């Protein structure tokens, strides 16, 4: 199951404390967001050495012999038939040529994670680059000493990686960081961790910049934060099903196994554990009971759908990852160097289209899952469609100055619809480049940003979602306590103003039936629902059957009494969740994070709740309530 | 390897005579498109039979009784909360509200519509539906009698209106007209009289179990996987063609250098690719015209071949994942309720979500799109003489090119191919409204992507047929170049010892007679401000200056004269008779021999009368109904 | 306003009879529709005779002499560089060239007719240098109904399907010909057929041809002619989603709209305020929120009441667009431009057809905007919760469990947005560097406006399922105000008989009142339901402020169930305010004139019937009667 990968994933970016790069030990994409964004996390490179010697040794007599080998010998991309035998100064005037960005940057993330990926290619012993060089990447990786590297210019990366070999040779326009407090010119920054500039020998000016770096490095953070957001969007359908009183029989296996997508069968198999022995779908079955014959037989798509929805997401994500591993760990260079056969190949490795592909597919994917939540997250809003719960989720119980997450909703379908847009491929957009050599190129890069961009906007969307199903909690909570309230007072009040059994039984019914959330802002209030049910069995208790005045009686104790008693254990309140599979996410949000129930009371604004749950996912702090939620599936 | 796979659907799609209809043999997108397309291929249901009773007389026990079941005792949709005794007028109403298509004519066609019979029948055969075995039954006769509704293109969100027309088919509405064969429309009452059925009376379950399927958007799936296959094929083999015509490097296929890039259609691609180009004609050429003026030529191939195995990787994953994907939706059970009458439930879901379909369908449009491009990239090289190494400007015979712009149309339509082409691989998965009075605030949109990527391969097809007969035009010109240089050679070679020139003059002349492109001076080969005599003229005053009197000067006029009266004859003369061979050793022999012979075309030229429009005509025809895999079959042969 | 501007081009579309070619007097996006639809609308080219034959002269004696003009002593795109004196030979391997589409599909005869109609134009102005007798050539081709058949695809905008026309008039064998609807033959037996023979060209004629932008605006000048009319009958239809939904009708009222300028949002709210002025409609509405006033919504929602604010930019982009497309229907979109006065030709690039292209794009997202509103405006009226008294899916019944109503239209209406949403997507940010390289911009403008007359005929679909169901609404609405009487009348009688007390009678005839009918017609006396509900709360009410009354509120009830339904029943059977409204015109022609009715379980027709017939008036133009009934004494 994709669900044990992920949480290896998780797991690995945790635990991970050195990242050993040596030719043959694969770098996952955990293994490269752990290196971005733990400083604690160390590369290890493993002296490979004799394969980089050989093949470094290999490319400078060759070019020393005046052998004829691409961008070597000769001129770079469409001035190919230039040849020289000016070695080094032909790979410093592609820097030079190269150094072209212009800042309006990559993230220190992105610049350390292409660095990694860089240094990881040059293991594999095509590439002719020196030893001393990957010492060089390994040590600048180590010291937190990264180039301030332009956002834009890679068809996919010359120019960026341009701004790492510009560091490397210590160019003075290269501007290095040191930490996040400082920031010098590359000579000076070479200085201070102990290294000299380089001098470029045969190749490696080439070699330095010919890769998919970037690209593969925005993208291995795009695909870490994909699985994780992706195994908590369908956990998270759960708590969706529990907080909505949705029906569980969606996750049947047998519904999945006749429509066999592994994402369809994974994902429903996942989300029948975790309602398995809920105390909310117990809830769920007492709900529908009641006027079983006036409420729905099924859910609406955003739940009852979720299975098949997920199940191309699910793959989508999933072999992505993959194909996203395998760049990571490839030689993306040219000329590739066989040395053992006495030859230079040359090719097109440097081509990121196999990453720039699945960067649109997972970006569609994504926007997928953000049309999900939506979908969710409307239903929720909507008395309509919430099973009892009140419109916006809001506590009230003045409802004319509290609108609940009506702010969130609005904030909602703002999210989807950019994400909707930011879904669009990149990839149908390659222009003929670089005086017409370049006539296909994979734009890899600049679709690995878009579905970053996209990812930002669902980790807004799960931080609102979430959010708003821990109020629905609370507010499932409160509902259970006022509704044994309202059922005590009016047992209470037909036994002391001595109603005949027939009546006591007719408004017990109504108290138990009648949605508490549409009364609850006026109890007692004649127009609203609990007093019209009420006032309905009375005239057919009369029917059926002094009896006035016992009946009028019961109507003025209860309209003294009720209010007051339903106050009394709101007030407290201001448990099922202890025995469901999400306390932890409940737990996490209310006491963690330190939330409480959304109200006119409550002074903490939405965006200073969903701001603290936003940071919890960015972080990767919601990857423990997660854990412990999936704690015992296989 | 892919390769394997698809050579696999093309052997099936031709060689299927029957379709097993089951509940246990799998259905293969070849199956689909070869009962859609071939009219001899015949559907059989294998009386599964027992289950499919089972079931629909439980569902039919469960509902008189009163059992509490969505869309058999309980109104539809977002109206579930409303329940209903009504068995048979229940079912009925469903069909009338789902006929609300609307004819523009534009239509679903036959071939999809039989195609969505198919699929549904097929769904049906896992018992969980609860229709009777003899509406099966009625639909294995309509497909056998290529009977079919007339069904309207749009209406679905993933596919109720449109499976209504086929239920409407079933139950006799006169609104509802069915085709039989190509030439015959009548209404529905009419067509079932045809072929000895009688109008059904809808059961509990059956007007939803027929209206309640992926079967539309699957069906369109289907053909579009099997084509995106095919073509896939076509294009990857084609890239090694190029590399033959356009004088490539075969290096770029080496297989190290993909091991070291192990994306698996990378490997797939490179491999295939290095095995048609070994032991090449064409890559002897090749490697002849680079050994010629070495450093004045590229040393390596511009991107549109040498990044071709780069470039199809992803391609060939994400056309392979996705027909998984399909074949996967052809062989499930897509409707709801699912009844699991050995556990007496019917279970509530979602199977009808045709989402897995929708979204692969985006994805695969995104990979024809990239198809297109590399097609794109490729002819754009041919076309230009400066990255045809030796290939004149749009492929022009000429000689006279001043009337004579070759297949510069061509150039034109490709343009305008790859433009719209990449403009329809937007996605439809990204523009799901909340439907159905908010009931359905998530849908698919599976058909409407589905007709998109039909539609997208309709233009790659395109685009390939005019590759291919380019490709034939360059094989003809390399042919004659190699010619016409043996020509100029004897010429210079003979002229030169019969003026009585030194031998270091006969050497210098020979080198320039093999090292100039033919193309360049074709036109006017004794013009003396062309390639051929500029190269002469700069000879010959070297030769003057080295062997530096008036005897050499007279002989060297003499030379030039005589090569002025007898050059462009001995010229023409080849290139009529050539008008009138490497390729015999090539893999892609039976592309060229199927282009030209057996599609009848030649060499394009002002003295062919047929238009560009007529050769790519038969070479679009061939490839839109199967005959272009004879010669893909051919050269694949031993891999 | 633009209102009256569109009313012009409906008038001029159903009315012209000749359309004048001379050079000077300007072709209308009308005009060309016309031509393409009305096979009795006849082409006049008026012998701008002495001007193209002058412009013929100068450009043959100056190919002749050997002068240097692109395309006529020189090769073309790309290859300018190359010489050639033999003219005619030059200009006949173009169009060999340019006879390169495919059939997969065709450019439509309707777009290929308004395509010679466009070139023919383009040459009158006298700068092509095409002989005079071409042009009548052309002429006498459109006015005895003869057109080349046209691959669909291969124009980065139009060579490829010019050389097709080009290809028709020099007698090219290949080149297949209709003559009316059912004839096809061979390009020369086609011109026999009409009394020409073939054409031999002559200097710059295969060019001036083949170098114009003639399919990409035949198919805008469709494209405009249709938005212009689908935009207003949008518009309009507004007005009388307004009446069936129980809107507010001050929505539009001036001062919201002059506060914020817009044009089209002062115009469309300036229609729409004429509209419903006085509507007696609005006055049922009226009446509805003052029944249980602080219990119902104090606004419309947006597909309503912000109609006018989302129909602003779509007018302006129709608009501006057809100027622009009508700007170069009446240009010399060729290349070279002959300046004969000035011994000139001068080399530009007027077959760039990048205004049309982009503006294509735009039309487009427009178009999709007006396909947005009718969703959303769709979607309200077919759920309860928004519709202010209509049943859901407006079914009749009364059995709901066998009436699912217009669902399956609501189904659709989303498949439909969907599709438009998608279609949206602009074609102009694909340009490839195209003709080795020569063509570096290109505009796409026929594939772009292809696009738009797609997503045309889906606003088409959606325009009439709206309607359809906007009848359906008003005969609910009209029912509804029958059948709330009868139940006062029931309620009213039956308190008389039963001697309640005048308290008791005043609170049951406002649950009467109160309660919306479609609540229960399904069973009106189902104790479950909202009116026996309504009824019951005001009885236990009644005891309170007043056990004889027990026995005659018990005997009320019992009346009630013996008397509701069948008096309900019989007057939906004969059932089975419009004619105060402005919208009596669409109602009366949908109703009447295309023969439909009520839709429901009784009705055999399907919606697919019902909508087809809306449709099919939409597509021929029909539409345009009610329209302009409906619109008689605006302004
Ligand atoms: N990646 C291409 C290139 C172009 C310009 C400068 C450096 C590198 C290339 F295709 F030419 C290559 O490096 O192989
Ligand atoms: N697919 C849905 C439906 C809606 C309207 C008519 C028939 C069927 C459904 F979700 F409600 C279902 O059938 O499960
Ligand atoms: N439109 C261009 C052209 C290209 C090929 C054939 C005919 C025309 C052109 F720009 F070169 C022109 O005609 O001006």
């Not at 190919?80 to 820097?95: F, K, Y």
């Not at 220190?108 to 060089?136: D, Q």
């Not at 592909?357 to 239903?379: C, H, N, P, S, W």
Request: proline fraction near 4%.
């Amino acid at each position: 199951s994709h669900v044990k990968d992920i949480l290896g994933l998780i797991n690995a970016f945790n635990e991970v404390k050195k990242i050993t790069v040596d030719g043959t030990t694969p770098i996952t994409v955990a293994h490269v967001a752990a290196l971005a964004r733990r400083h604690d996390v160390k590369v290890a490179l493993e002296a490979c050495r004799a394969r980089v010697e050989t093949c470094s040794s290999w490319v400078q007599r060759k070019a020393e012999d005046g052998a004829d080998i691409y961008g070597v010998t000769t001129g770079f991309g469409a001035c190919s038939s230039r040849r020289t035998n000016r070695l080094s100064e032909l790979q410093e005037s592609l820097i030079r040529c190269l150094l072209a960005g212009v800042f309006t940057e990559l993230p220190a993330t992105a610049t350390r994670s292409a660095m990694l990926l860089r240094l990881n290619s040059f293991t594999y012993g095509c590439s002719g680059i020196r030893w001393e060089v990957m010492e060089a990447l390994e040590k600048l990786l180590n010291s937190n000493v990264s180039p301030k590297v332009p956002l834009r210019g890679s068809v996919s990366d010359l120019i960026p990686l341009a701004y790492i070999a510009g560091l490397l040779i210590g160019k003075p326009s290269v501007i290095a960081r040191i930490g996040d407090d400082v920031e010098v010119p590359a000579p000076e920054a070479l200085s201070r961790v102990g290294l000299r500039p380089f001098k470029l020998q045969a190749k490696e000016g080439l070699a330095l910049v010919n890769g998919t770096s970037f690209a593969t490095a925005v993208a291995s953070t795009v695909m870490y934060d994909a699985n994780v957001l992706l195994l908590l969007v369908e956990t998270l359908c759960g708590m969706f099903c529990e907080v909505i009183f949705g029906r569980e029989e969606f996750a049947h296996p047998l519904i999945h196994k006749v429509k066999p997508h592994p994402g369809q069968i994974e994902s429903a198999e996942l989300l029948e554990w975790l309602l398995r022995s809920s105390p909310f779908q117990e809830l769920s079955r007492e709900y529908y009971s009641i006027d079983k014959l006036k409420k729905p037989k099924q859910d609406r798509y955003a739940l009852r759908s979720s299975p098949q929805w997920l199940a191309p997401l699910v793959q989508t994500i999933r072999d992505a990852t993959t194909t996203v591993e395998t760049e990571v760990n490839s030689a993306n260079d040219n000329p590739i160097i066989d040395h053992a056969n006495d030859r230079a190949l040359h090719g097109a490795n440097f081509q990121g289209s196999a990453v720039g592909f699945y960067m649109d597919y997972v970006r569609i994917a994504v926007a997928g899952l953000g049309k999900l939540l939506f979908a969710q997250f409307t239903e929720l809003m909507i008395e309509y469609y919430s099973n009892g719960l009140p419109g916006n989720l809001s506590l009230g119980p003045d409802l004319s100055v509290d609108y609940g997450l009506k702010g969130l909703d609005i904030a909602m379908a703002a999210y989807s619809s950019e994400l909707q847009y930011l879904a669009n491929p990149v990839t149908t957009h390659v222009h003929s480049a670089e005086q017409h050599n370049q006539d296909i190129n994979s734009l890899a890069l600049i679709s690995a940003r878009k579905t970053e961009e996209a990812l930002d906007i669902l980790k807004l969307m799960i931080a609102s979602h979430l959010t708003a199903m821990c109020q629905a909690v609370d507010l499932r909570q409160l509902e259970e306590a006022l509704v044994k309230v309202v059922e005590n007072v009016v047992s209470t009040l037909a036994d002391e103003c001595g109603l005949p059994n027939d009546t006591k039984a007719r408004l017990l019914y109504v108290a138990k039936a009648v949605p508490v959330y549409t009364y609850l802002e006026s109890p007692c209030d004649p127009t609203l629902p609990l007093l019209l049910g009420l006032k309905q069995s009375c005239f057919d208790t009369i029917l059926a059957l002094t009896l006035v005045d016992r009946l009028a009686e019961f109507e003025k104790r209860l309209s003294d009494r009720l209010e007051n008693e339903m106050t009394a254990v709101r007030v407290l309140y201001e448990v099922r969740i202890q025995g469901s599979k999400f306390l932890p996410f409940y737990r996490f949000v209310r006491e963690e994070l330190d939330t409480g129930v959304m109200s006119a009371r409550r002074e903490q604004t939405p965006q200073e709740d969903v701001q603290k749950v936003f940071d919890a996912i960015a972080d990767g702090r919601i990857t423990v309530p997660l854990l412990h939620c999936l704690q015992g599936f296989l």
